[PDB]
Design a protein around this ligand. Structure first.
Ligand SMILES: [Mg+2]
Ligand SMILES: [Mg+2]
Ligand SMILES: [Zn+2]
Length: 354
DNA sequence: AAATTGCCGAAGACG
DNA sequence: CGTCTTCGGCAATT
């Protein structure tokens, strides 16, 4: 039964081919745009991220995430209150001085110009039906809508890339030492970290200058390298069901959010965060044998329900950042979601049948 | 040094 | 399950 659901969630190669062909052409064109000439964005480089490129996108290849990352030397980070995740960026005749607000590099000013450029470049595409969606306050995304003729969205995310050691709020995060190990953890933390122009919600409004840490590159590496054994899911090793559990949980949330508006505050990043914690708690590949898919999925569910009940789901890279805090999500919303998940769980998941 | 190239891993397709 | 295939990521090459 979960096996039947996975078969239906699995992406079709024909759909993948048709979608990738069009997405790649539009993205290449926009990136070449940025890269020329006089632009404050001239050195951007592309990094594909999120569930399609991690092979956990479900149902249809209809949403792609791509970062246009800019290396910015000598940046100084000031943590925004004690949030752990949010920062003001300042500096130690640069192109970026246009985006200054005092000595602070404004996320909003820089994103606005980035968006402005993308829109003008989209206007020049005559051979493909592509438009820029209305902007969402506080989001770091410039979202394209492509009609292929099927609808595909592409989120183009500006990012700052910094090569220094990671901010100290991350020092006790990424607790992979008994799963992926200390050499892996140390090596991942020697790679750059990223900031995206997603604004902190501060009371009734966004703080327009703030940026948020991103570990999309690390998350992508983890999904591609997720077993305690080096051969997990390789051609000379044993398949596990870790990614299948993540797909099933993302589907469950998606189906629930489609029918209940009260679940608007929940998102697939909560599910991904929860399963990173579960992969830490249950590190052995033998605990994710495909023969045991039903019980692995059940355990992930039990853990997610416990997060809800205790109002606690800490960011995997930034442990003091509680994604399920009362400030982010009302207690009533979590209680509403717990009720729905329990009903599905106790009734053999009728919602999987649509 | 911007653009092309091939290698091969992940995973869909199909028997 | 095996074998075949395409897409993506990498970096040397040029
Ligand atoms: Mg996505
Ligand atoms: Mg997205
Ligand atoms: Zn595996």
């Amino acid at each position: 039964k979960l096996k039947k659901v996975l078969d239906k969630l699995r992406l079709k190669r024909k759909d993948i081919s048709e979608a990738a062909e069009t997405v790649n052409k539009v993205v290449e064109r926009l990136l070449r745009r940025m890269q020329k000439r006089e632009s404050e964005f001239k050195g951007v480089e592309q990094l594909n991220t999120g569930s399609y490129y991690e092979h956990v996108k479900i149902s249809a290849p209809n949403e792609f995430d791509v970062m246009f990352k800019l290396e910015v030397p000598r940046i100084e980070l000031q943590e925004y209150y004690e949030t752990g995740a949010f920062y003001l960026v300042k500096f130690k005749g640069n192109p970026l001085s246009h985006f200054l607000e005092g000595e602070v590099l404004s996320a909003t000013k820089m994103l606005s110009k980035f968006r402005k450029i993308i829109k003008e470049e989209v206007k020049e595409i005559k051979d493909i039906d592509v438009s820029v969606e209305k902007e969402k306050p506080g989001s770091p995304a410039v979202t394209l809508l492509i009609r292929n003729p099927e609808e595909i969205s592409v989120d183009i995310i500006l990012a700052l890339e910094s090569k220094g050691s990671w901010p100290i709020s991350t020092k006790e995060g990424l607790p992979i030492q008994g799963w992926l190990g200390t050499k892996v953890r140390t090596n991942l933390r020697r790679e750059p970290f990223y900031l995206v122009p997603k604004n902190a919600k501060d009371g009734n409004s966004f703080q327009g200058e703030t940026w948020r840490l991103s570990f999309s590159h690390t998350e992508k590496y983890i999904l591609n390298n997720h077993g305690i054994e080096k051969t997990c899911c390789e051609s000379s090793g044993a398949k596990c069901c870790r990614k299948e559990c993540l797909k099933l949980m993302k589907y469950l949330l998606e189906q629930l959010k489609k029918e209940f508006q009260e679940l608007d505050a929940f998102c697939s990043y909560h599910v991904k965060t929860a399963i990173f914690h579960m992969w830490t708690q249950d590190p052995q590949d033998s605990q994710w044998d495909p023969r045991n898919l039903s019980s692995c999925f059940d355990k992930l569910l039990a853990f997610f329900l416990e997060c809800l009940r205790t109002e606690k789901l800490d960011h995997y890279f930034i442990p003091k950042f509680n994604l399920f805090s009362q400030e982010l999500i009302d207690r009533k919303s979590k209680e509403f979601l717990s009720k729905k998940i329990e009903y599905e769980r106790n009734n053999g998941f009728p919602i999987f049948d649509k």
